[PDB]
Amino acid sequence: INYYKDAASSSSAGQSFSMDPSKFTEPVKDIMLKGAPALN
Amino acid sequence: INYYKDAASSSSAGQSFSMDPSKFTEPVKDIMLKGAPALN
Amino acid sequence: QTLASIKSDSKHTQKVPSLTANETGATLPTTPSDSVETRTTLMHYTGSETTLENFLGRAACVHVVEIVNKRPTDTEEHRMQLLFNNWKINLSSLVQLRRKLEMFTYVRFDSEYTIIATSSQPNEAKFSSNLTIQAMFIPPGAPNPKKWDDYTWQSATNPSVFFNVGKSARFSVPYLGIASAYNCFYDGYSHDNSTTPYGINVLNHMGSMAFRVVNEHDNHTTHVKVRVYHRAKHIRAWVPRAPRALEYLHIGRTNYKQSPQNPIKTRKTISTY
């Protein structure tokens, strides 16, 4: 299916990934939405 | 993958080789970088 | 498939997902099931459309140049008269693309270019001509042509592309670094000097692309516009950032108008629906 040898010539495959929003939404050290007070 | 029979018609494959700079950098008979004096 | 929502009934508890502290900087995930009763239902969605790859993977016009078929004039350089027209590569020129890229701090990808040429003859030409167009990539440090027919066009080592007007060329260009990712922004200088230029222009050394009408001079002037499109492949990006709100002024700069128009539209009152 590939006609060229350089990687650059390949099609824009094509592999999906799971999401990982925690990098941006939960960078906070040692917390969890337990329903527990955020600051205590 | 080859469509022609003459070798000349083939693509510019494609086989890499290891380097051998000793032909040009160490043509000197019987030496080595031992840290030993070059002339003794 | 996965659930968008999980059946949840009325609660009376000590656990309160609805209260938090944004002061922490966290944006802890919550669901409708935390505020209201809900029915169980499926996502029926993968997010494929929103992948970074699909977002930055659509071709966009990057730059447009104009070159002509014209009898050289002794009094002008072949750049003054557009017999030859060297584009300095920079995806920031046509700002729709620029924004999509600026949304990330560091971006890595292979490029795919598509080059399309169109001719026109505003003069009294007696016939059309499907001119052959040459594009030549000139890496930093490589010779810059002085003449439309200079020796540099031999392209002994420079990648080059030949195509006709009405046709298009397409080719891939691998990530050119030199770093591990392209910088969209650069909070710095080329060196430690008060007068040194500031910003990404410092790092943008992708070279230039020279365009030429290969054909010899005809009996009339022909104008050719060449449009360059770019599409990213195998795209990775890091450190997302807020999109620019204000109009761009110049390439490689984050400058804006001294008295900018506030992007936010106003209303009579905070209470107006």
Next chain:
Amino acid sequence: GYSDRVEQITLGNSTITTQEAANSIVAYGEWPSFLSDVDASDVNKTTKPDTSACRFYTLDSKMWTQGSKGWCWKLPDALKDMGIFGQNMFFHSQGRTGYTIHVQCNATKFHSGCLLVVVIPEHQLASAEGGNVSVLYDKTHPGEKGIDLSEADSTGPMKDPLYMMDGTLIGNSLIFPHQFINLRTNNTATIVVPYINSVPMDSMTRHNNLSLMVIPIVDITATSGTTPSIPVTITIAPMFLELSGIRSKAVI
């Protein structure tokens, strides 16, 4: 037991103790760490000053009063005069480090107001002159003084905090590692930032990596009395400082 609001940070020969804090942030979910043997391209054995540099330094406090527009510091520039860390910046060709940043702002229960503390990587600044005018070295490298957004400067960067000196609305800056100091609750913010770059190591002097901004989203105010004035103190430490390419002290 323990509460999230109470924390002690020990680093080198210095400590910070807080009683009213929000959980600290580790930017992008990653701790600062040393360059690995598969990241490095630099053949020079690196230097790891450790304690001698990786300690807390405090920047001269600034006053927060009504009408203040906020302030901005550049890293590593802000620490260029800070003892050993400072000197190491000029004796090495390149270096690498993460930071721990603490913004402190005391108040009583009769005060209100809120600071937004944001760490912005590669914060390329807009010139005050607009057009195609660049910002001079001198105005991007104030050191400890920082950039006071309240102070006019026709040759400096754009100052209006609505846009974070780059044509991008402040409202969306929360995409960056950030934390608020809401005088109602916490009185300090703590952000830990890993080294971020496209290059394994880089110049410590021709280039900043992080831009720390502190903006009074809600003006300081008291329930009664005259306009309040609360100092804002910023304390910053290198995390994993790794240096390379020793040479004659740079002169700039």
Next chain:
Amino acid sequence: GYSDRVEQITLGNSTITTQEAANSIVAYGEWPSFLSDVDASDVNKTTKPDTSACRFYTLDSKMWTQGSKGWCWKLPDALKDMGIFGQNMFFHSQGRTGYTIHVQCNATKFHSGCLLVVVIPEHQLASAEGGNVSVLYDKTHPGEKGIDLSEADSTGPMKDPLYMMDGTLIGNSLIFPHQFINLRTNNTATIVVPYINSVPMDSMTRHNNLSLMVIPIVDITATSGTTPSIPVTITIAPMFLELSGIRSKAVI
């Protein structure tokens, strides 16, 4: 094969190469090393600058001519201005280090003469004034300049090399780690000295540990021509530098 006279010393980012050398000396038969956990009394985690400090520094060369009396340098004082090592001396309460000392003096086969290179620990100097007069700080801490025994100074130390500035005859100074530079053969001396003290670590500024003296036991001379003049170059590096007690830069 190898000859003792040819040697390479690599340290940090610097090297020394010799072709006409005498076997180097490791003073008292012991290599420099770090303070152990049973020697230490200092509870502060120490700093080990390694490469950033432990490299060769060269002191401004001095000319050896007929009539020269010799020269003296104090360690660590001599290196007080030497980049990072220098700065570290003032930012730390105490420190510990050994040294590698190289004395270089080139000549041809038509030259003769001989230097004695001696490293003397705790070389307490006699005042030029004799009596009960002490030597001032300023005259025991010349830094790189060293003490030129050829130069008169009514407030300095005794200068006559017959006694090594302490009432003790030079002839017996060979009891100390020493090496000669006999222009007939070697053209350089190399001495490695471990940290020597009664105290595990000590001030880097109020006290010197070693006194390096170079004395022209036999005056420089040529077989023919005018009085010769040969530079003497001294290159010194810290071996195992260990520092403690970071504080505001000492001012003296």
